[PDB]
Symmetry: C3
Subunit: 156 residues, 3 copies
């Protein structure tokens, strides 16, 4: 099998409801108290997209296929999968597309959370947010989405 450098991209989207004037969202392990997420899961697009980026990189079946609370269970599986396949994470770059919340205000916390759950250094993690210019389903605050991009580097 292929044991060289591997690229992965994870994608996720969840429906949200912003608590304006007319379950609580979790994002990179950080509770977002002014936004509700309409999902059976915790709605954490960052954690979910990171997991699928890792699975994708290794050619494993995705979380939905493998397993038809949970975000922590999936992140620990992914961490241990990387280890048992003799890989290290190089870096991860995460793009959140969302009107709200403001990722730059919670970046440090998200990066700390990701570093802890994956057992990597904060210097290996990037998380950035961009609005959708108030256009389309994301722009009208009906949903938020995440693209997670990762490199896995073979050990020795």
């Amino acid at each position: 099998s292929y044991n060289g450098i591997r690229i992965g991209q994870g994608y996720d989207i969840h429906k949200i409801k912003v608590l304006d004037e007319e379950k609580t969202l979790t994002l990179g392990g950080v509770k977002i108290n002014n936004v509700l997420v309409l999902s059976h899961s915790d709605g954490d697009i960052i954690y979910h997209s990171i997991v699928d980026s890792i699975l994708g990189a290794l050619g494993s079946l995705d979380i939905g296929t493998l397993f038809p609370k949970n975000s922590a269970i999936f992140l620990r599986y992914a961490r241990l999968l990387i280890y048992k396949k003799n890989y290290d994470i190089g870096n991860v770059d995460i793009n959140v597309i969302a009107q709200v919340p403001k990722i730059s205000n919670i970046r440090k916390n998200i990066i700390k959370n990701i570093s802890t759950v994956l057992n990597i250094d904060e210097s290996q993690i990037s998380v950035k947010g961009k609005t959708h210019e108030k256009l389309g389903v994301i722009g009208e605050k009906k949903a938020i989405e995440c693209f997670a991009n990762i490199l896995l580097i073979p050990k020795n």
Copy 2:
């Protein structure tokens, strides 16, 4: 010129019509009998995005520019282009965004088809599907889209 590791990302989108109650789509070389694709081409977002990921990685002009049935012709061009530029494929990770069909039900076939047409091992290929939460043009089954991410590794 640059002869080091290369990253590529391919994107494609095609209009579809799901055969519900009020040309046949091909996806990763697999016929999808309950979905029509409204395109001049075969509508195979997976094969097309894979080709453009390879061209993109190598800095070549895209399929639309190079060549203004066909999917097989383009995939063989891409395979031979990688070879003549002294590269091997590392791995490819493919993200389909679509309400239907269910990629996990046809994953094995798609992966087998990609491995055959690119002459690589199945362990170098990932294909995953995600819905769009029934929101927007993808969510309303008006279209399907694909992001293909690839690494090309120099030979010796």
Copy 3:
């Protein structure tokens, strides 16, 4: 800190108005005389996404966070950031999603501009355009978007 190969992905979107029958857009440093961009910035999704791909790859704060004309200022920052962190650019692959303008007609100019501002060879750059099948906000010419994908390679 991590000093190995790094992946980055930049995303950007800007609102546009096509000058049909019932500020001027800049794209990869090329003026697009038949399209207006509705932004406080120059609206250059290519340059902006390239910058954020570089920042993302290195784990730096994004342009919006770092700096709350300008596109040239940000591209020179990114170039010098790569240098001071002891990295070289491997290659960059850029995907523009837009009905208009036609990227293939201005590809050579964009690639020349990117090579000049980043001080890299044209063989390290790919830029490709795809329509959105006249569907959604992009398809209805309300916006254009860019995904920039990059590898940074450590020096020696």
